[PDB]
Design a binder for this molecule. Structure first.
Ligand code: GN1
Ligand code: GN1
Ligand code: GN1
Lengths: 388, 388, 388
């Protein structure tokens, strides 16, 4: 977590055009959270002294949610509005408009569309920054395909010189594969000063935040880039292709953590587990399964195949097979499926049975009660050990 | 599209033994089209002056379909029959039997089993061929595993010498990884001449089309090979293993195009979209979904998970979840699924509901009509805003 | 298969802690067999003169099954019990306690958690061992990630010196990527002698079997390591992450063999086929399908999508779509699904139909009998060509 007097700016003002969506980019959803929700969670964990989200384009619709999140995380989150889209640098300049004019602390600039960004990466950033006592630290990474991203230019001694954006690069600089991750740490005084000197001269007619690296190099200040090996943690999201690739890479990591904690997952590539889901030891998840939202599964269960559960509580030793359910509970040792539909409000007691072609809506089903097949049970209370 | 006086021969005469199937190889199906259908579509788009499909082995069963396709593409397609399987070169010689004896135009020889072959690749071929004013241009590619394919031999100056087939290669030439793609462009006069000189001497006792590259090299004519980086576009299909790998690579590209045009696809690896399918902006497709045939999905929909739709029209803002349907329409704002079965003839109006364990056959269901669960509706007309 | 007087020790005494499971590691299940079942099958095929499984930790629960397997494979399998977990070397020393004190034959030491280990790999091992007339042969492999495994140390002439375990390695030796596979072949006399000299001095305070390679090198005896290119065949299983990766790699190979023998499998990554399953020519398996246990599918069938069948017999030309069934038979030309549930005891004759939302339990359904939708048929006999 964070030394000491630290302020983090989350930049979320972009137009998000390439998503091709009426829903603002950062609100696009991923393993149970919006990209923005992930990024604010990761950041809050470190507990900066300040947390500033720069909203732009769609602030109207994003703002409410930041405050919604601000409460959840029991912490204050500031919102700065960038008026004109006059570039990422201007965005930072807007961010700063929300700290006192003489905040002495370090500044960490990150983005709203890097949902994989984690605690360690961020920490390491400050550790390096303070250690090498840098005026700026920028996180980089090496990609197989560097299109869209800005390129890190280095002389022979591996020393940083400047960052040149996709649009502005020569065709030879496009062959460069080391990219700007868009996560920074700044000496605050050394930042303000550098932003004052940015020109919109070339070539998206804009004020580039990247331009700062070359300015400060010329200033005579110490300019460190820190290479992040695991690109995933630092990858951005501009289109729905990247959104899916990252949804995939995060899922893989969520499943792995469950596997390493005692859950058999027969097919990780087709088992989808949202971030809040809990699962007990020696549970088996068969292929084609989504466990979404607040779903908790106990130990020694069998879930799947083809099972989707949103906000479902599942006891120990239950079996939930080919079921589509939500906002329900399933008791210890209960048997549900195949081809069962649990609508919200279904509470099925321990060792209850819900068989094939059974739909339950808003019903309490007592301990040991069987509903064997082809039945709708809606808005009803059923006693224990009965038979429907 | 095609300069100018151009004739393309599609070779589809092979025995297709390794498919191990009673259905001829090129008729094997892939994202809604037979390999042959893909290849004739790609080719027709460029509009050669002539289009000749060389049929052999199974011509009896393939021919009808070429003429079926010939109509669809509003264009004439010629069929040459190769009698004996006396080699790929003989096949070309058969192809030519369908042009006038003095056709002056260039000849493009491609194959029936390269379903990924696209417009640009083909164009580039002629552009290179005419530019370097070649007697022959052959397309190559580099593979991780070059088994089965023929090897490109090059001296130190990267200059082509000959092509040596899987069977005939030394074991050291098998270490070579650059392969013959089996797509060519020829100077017509320089082709005829070279084929006359082919011998069946070694080692599948046959007349190899590949043999031409070495002959023309000796002739003193200009022999260019053009390396294709994206192997996929140029990969062939000899067994069902390759068929699936290519079905996969094409799917990935179909999904990506949808993603980049505003469709959220949660899991591309398990979402299958045939080539004709249309999908509207901000639709979400959940995992385990096949959209097959002429299926069109509007905007702001939710399809999936576990949904298969063949030739289904789906309005804007409909939800189609765990449904198996075909030859049906689903109205704007309609709710179908989970566990719903739409047989051909189902027409469900705007804001209609078809609930769990409901099967509809050949029925009109009017606007706002609910069928909540566990019901068969067959051969019926139901009024608007009614309740079943 | 095996020369001549050969004895194989299968080591299965580990604590298996990293599985994090109440079920002993080697009993963890994989494509229809426990890891131990796979390994004993592969080994029995070669027909060693002796077969010794060293049980430790959980012998109580594993032993019965070895004898269960011993019968199936019509062959005797010996069980040696290792008392204290005093290391892998001690385990071997325990293994030997079950051969006569003067068994002259070669000894092959393999592990219980390498379920992919095949016939050829094993053969090649002895072929090399006898050919180079080695005192020990160890199988190695190169990994992208060598964590957990023991490292092969080689001087400049590629000659083996010693094997250093994960725990005991310097941080520079951890950069080494060539790993000990834990499959060996020994000259028996040269083994006994070397084990006598093992010390528990460093650093898991234990008797390492690996230590033998360095001892025998010093002895002056001939020490060969044989690199296995296909790591999969030789990969071990310590956690559920590896279990799934291997379940995946084996599946891929099972599907490929079916594809190459005439079965169309649209999506191999999401089609799961246990090892005993048979499938006929020109069958098509659609995505999301599991064929488990003793399931046999005839030719020209259609299975899937979303179909799970455990121990189901399926005739020629049947269609089994969106079905969840087990211990049942489905006749030639029969139509089952979508959303059909076959419980054990279901026998559906040729050209029978079981339609949507139909569950069958323990019933005989005669030739040409239809059960069109939304029906339970339990414990019943139905005549031919009838209608339910
Ligand atoms: C001018 C600027 O700040 N460009 C950054 C920024 O790109 P945008 O395309 O403006 O989002 O973030 C990228 C990381 O996702 C990084 O590659 C790039 O250099
Ligand atoms: C004699 C001949 O023309 N061989 C060609 C041809 O192989 P066949 O195995 O005959 O289909 O097409 C291949 C491309 O799929 C290419 O590798 C090869 O060189
Ligand atoms: C002391 C010893 O025998 N270690 C072996 C053995 O490891 P364990 O972690 O003890 O299972 O098997 C491994 C192969 O899975 C191999 O890498 C290693 O060198």
């Amino acid at each position: 977590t964070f030394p000491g007097d630290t302020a983090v700016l989350v930049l979320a003002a972009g137009p998000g055009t390439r998503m091709r969506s009426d829903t603002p980019k950062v609100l696009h959803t991923l393993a149970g959270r919006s990209m923005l929700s992930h990024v604010l969670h990761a950041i809050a964990k470190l507990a900066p002294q300040r947390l500033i989200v720069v909203l732009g384009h769609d602030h109207q619709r994003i703002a409410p949610l930041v405050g919604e999140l601000a409460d959840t995380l029991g912490r204050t989150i500031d919102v700065a509005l960038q008026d004109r889209p006059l570039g990422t640098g201007h965005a930072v300049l807007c961010g700063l408009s929300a700290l006192p004019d003489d905040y002495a602390g370090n500044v960490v600039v990150t983005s709203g569309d890097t949902p994989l960004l984690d605690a360690d990466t961020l920490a390491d950033l400050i550790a390096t920054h303070r250690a090498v006592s840098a005026a700026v630290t920028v996180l980089t990474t090496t990609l197989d395909d560097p299109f869209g991203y800005g390129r890190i230019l280095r002389t022979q001694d591996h020393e940083v010189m400047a960052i040149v954006e996709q649009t502005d690069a020569t065709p030879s600089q496009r062959e460069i594969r080391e990219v700007n991750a868009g996560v920074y740490a700044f000496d605050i005084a050394a930042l303000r000063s550098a932003l004052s000197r940015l020109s919109s001269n070339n070539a998206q007619q804009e004020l580039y935040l990247t331009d700062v690296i070359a300015i400060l190099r010329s200033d005579g200040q110490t300019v460190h880039a820190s290479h992040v090996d695991d690109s995933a943690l630092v990858a951005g999201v501009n289109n729905r292709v990247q959104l899916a690739e990252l949804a995939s890479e995060l899922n893989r990591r969520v499943v792995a953590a469950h596997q390493l904690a005692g859950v058999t997952v027969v097919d990780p590539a087709t088992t989808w587990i949202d971030v809040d889901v809990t699962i007990g030891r020696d549970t088996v998840i068969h292929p084609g399964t989504q466990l979404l939202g607040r779903t908790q599964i106990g130990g020694r269960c069998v879930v799947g195949p083809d099972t989707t559960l949103t906000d479902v509580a599942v006891g120990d030793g239950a079996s939930v097979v080919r079921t589509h359910g939500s906002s329900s509970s399933i008791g210890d040792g209960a048997a549900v499926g195949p081809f069962t539909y649990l609508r919200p409000g279904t509470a099925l007691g321990a060792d209850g049975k819900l068989g094939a072609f059974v739909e339950v809506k808003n019903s309490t089903i007592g301990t040991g009660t069987k509903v064997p097949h082809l039945t709708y049970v809606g808005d009803a209370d059923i006693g224990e050990y009965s038979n429907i």
